[PDB]
């Protein structure tokens, strides 16, 4: 009768704005903070930490702190910084419950130290106000320019700053009486690397002089610390996907547990983000297995539900992924592994069929990214071309994220090709449609699922007009789904997305297996021979899992970012 963990792995998330810092007092002169932080790389990579804090009150805090068993501190920050100096803004706000909705002026922060034995020290001025949570900070080197990341002496550059509830924190009980905490905080990265931080403070009226003693040790030196790739979460190549996951899968589980849930046990996400990497898609699913998860909702790209699906399979763990159709996947043999979306072998042959009988351009050019995903659709494509005898002109490729296609415009032009197919995804698309109308080409343009979301529309604007894809039926039209789509609209949530319904379909999978055994051998067996009602029709299995006749369909795509036959 304990709720059942389903782990759903999204791609290149924003994650909360707010951090919980868990707080507990073990007695009356300690107070223990637990952080988990996720940082992001220039890259869109999630960095893992894990923060112990310890709080040594030379007086031991009122009784009334401790009667108050956990509380929790929900803190957000900001970072603009150089090479030399950084500036920072702290909002925090403090509640007894895990339910989101003289005092100090003025301070100093001496931070000083070494990460990977190269010292730093830095120093600088702020304010806050005592009453609402808020701090600011200027801090500039003393030494030269940083040669690691300045994200991570965030969060350590001042509780004194906080309220609780009812009043004063005990952080701020302890400055006004005069006598004071020292902190020591200890962070765990998942890379094995270790950050040590002491604290000691003094007053001066309303102004706090911070001194803060940092050793960090054994960072990789290509590391996103030592290599300068922090950044805050700017939106992803994949950040649609994920987005698009998680709506699905949280209107499922919510429509599942209020239905009474699998026989009264209701469904919870556990939610996980892979960032379409490989690396990364393995230390998601290292960590899957290691919280007792046995059942997976994802691995969105073909890319990282590859690496991913090899320990799921080792470790005895469903996997359903909703998204990756690379047919390389289910071509191992693996008996864990099922999908709720087609193959590019069956998505480029559905295209090749559209240009030969009801386009039939002249001059054919057939672009890549050189993926898994983009090469292999092409190929698709150029093999269902040369067998109708389409006048293939040239076959290409370009790198995955630059923001500049001149040099595919130009030879497009000079080479009057009215039509090109783009195997791959929304962000290079998205410039080529716009680069392209932009030079005046009339060309039309052909993509897969990949370029059928509403940021291929919000990248192209007009051009993305009369673009052709392939992608699954628009299920979100079905009247079956109409309640479905309600709920994602009650939440200004956008229901169209194909990856919702694929999603949806995948836990009502899970569901249907889970009724019967919550082995996931059953399961995968039970759903191979078995046909499932979903919002995508039902659902019927091979013994590899592929779903049986998936036909993808062909669809005019609108800078409105809808799509129509
Ligand atoms: C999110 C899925 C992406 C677009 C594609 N189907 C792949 O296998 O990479
Ligand atoms: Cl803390």
Not at 69 to 91: A, C, G, I, N
Not at 130 to 139: A, H, I, R
Not at 157 to 182: K, N, R, T
Not at 522 to 550: C, H, Q, R
Request: glycine letters at 10%; charged letters at 20%.
């Amino acid at each position: 009768m304990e709720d059942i963990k389903v782990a759903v792995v999204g791609a290149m998330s924003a994650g909360a704005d707010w951090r919980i810092s868990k707080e507990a007092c073990p007695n009356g002169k300690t107070l223990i903070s637990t952080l988990k932080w996720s940082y992001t790389t220039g890259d869109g990579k999630r960095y893992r930490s894990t923060a112990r804090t310890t709080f040594t009150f030379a007086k031991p805090m009122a009784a009334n702190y401790l009667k108050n068993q956990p509380m929790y501190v929900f803190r957000r920050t900001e970072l603009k910084h150089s090479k030399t100096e950084m500036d920072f803004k702290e909002w925090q706000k403090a509640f007894t419950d895990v339910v989101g909705m003289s005092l100090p002026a003025t301070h100093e922060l001496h931070i000083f130290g070494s990460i990977n034995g190269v010292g730093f020290d830095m120093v600088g001025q702020g304010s806050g106000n005592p009453n609402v949570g808020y701090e600011e900070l200027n801090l500039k080197s003393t030494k030269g320019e940083l040669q690691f990341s300045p994200w991570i002496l965030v969060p350590h550059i001042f509780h004194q700053y906080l309220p609780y509830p009812d009043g004063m924190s005990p952080f701020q009980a302890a400055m006004v009486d005069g006598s004071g905490y020292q902190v020591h905080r200890t962070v765990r990265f998942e890379d094995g690397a270790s950050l040590t931080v002491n604290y000691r403070y003094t007053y001066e009226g309303s102004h706090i002089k911070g001194e803060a003693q940092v050793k960090g040790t054994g960072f990789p030196a290509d590391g996103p610390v030592m290599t300068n790739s922090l950044t805050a979460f700017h939106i992803g190549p994949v950040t649609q996907y994920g987005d698009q996951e998680f709506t699905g899968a949280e209107q499922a589980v919510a429509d599942i547990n209020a239905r009474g849930g699998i026989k009264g046990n209701k469904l919870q996400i556990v939610k996980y983000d892979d960032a379409c990497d490989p690396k990364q898609a393995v230390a998601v699913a290292n960590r899957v297995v290691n919280d007792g998860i046995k059942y997976v909702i994802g691995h969105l790209c073909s890319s990282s539900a590859q690496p991913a699906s090899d320990i799921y399979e080792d470790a005895g763990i469903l996997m359903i992924t909703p998204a990756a159709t690379a047919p390389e996947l289910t071509a191992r043999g693996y008996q864990l592994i099922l999908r709720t979306t087609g193959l590019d072998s069956d998505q480029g042959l559905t295209a090749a069929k559209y240009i030969l009988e009801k386009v039939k351009p002249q001059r054919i050019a057939i672009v890549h990214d050189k993926q898994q995903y983009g090469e292999g659709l092409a190929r698709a494509v150029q093999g269902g071309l040369k067998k109708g005898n389409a006048n293939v002109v040239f076959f290409d490729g370009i790198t995955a994220g630059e923001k500049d296609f001149s040099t595919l415009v130009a030879r497009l032009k000079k080479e009057n090709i009215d039509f090109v197919y783009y195997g791959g995804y929304h962000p290079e698309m998205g410039q080529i449609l716009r680069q392209a109308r932009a030079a005046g080409l009339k060309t039309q343009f052909m993509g897969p699922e990949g370029v059928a979301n509403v940021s291929l529309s919000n990248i192209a604007g007009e051009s993305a007009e009369g673009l052709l894809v392939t992608k699954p039926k628009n299920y979100d039209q079905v009247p079956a789904n109409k309640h479905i789509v309600d709920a994602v609209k009650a939440k200004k949530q956008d229901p169209s997305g194909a990856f919702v319904w694929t999603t949806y379909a995948a836990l009502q999978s899970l569901q249907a297996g889970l009724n019967q055994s919550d082995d996931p051998a059953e399961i995968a067996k039970y759903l191979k021979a078995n046909s499932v009602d979903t919002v995508m029709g039902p659902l019927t299995w091979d013994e590899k899992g592929d779903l049986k006749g998936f036909e993808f369909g062909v669809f005019d795509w609108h800078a409105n970012g809808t799509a129509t036959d």
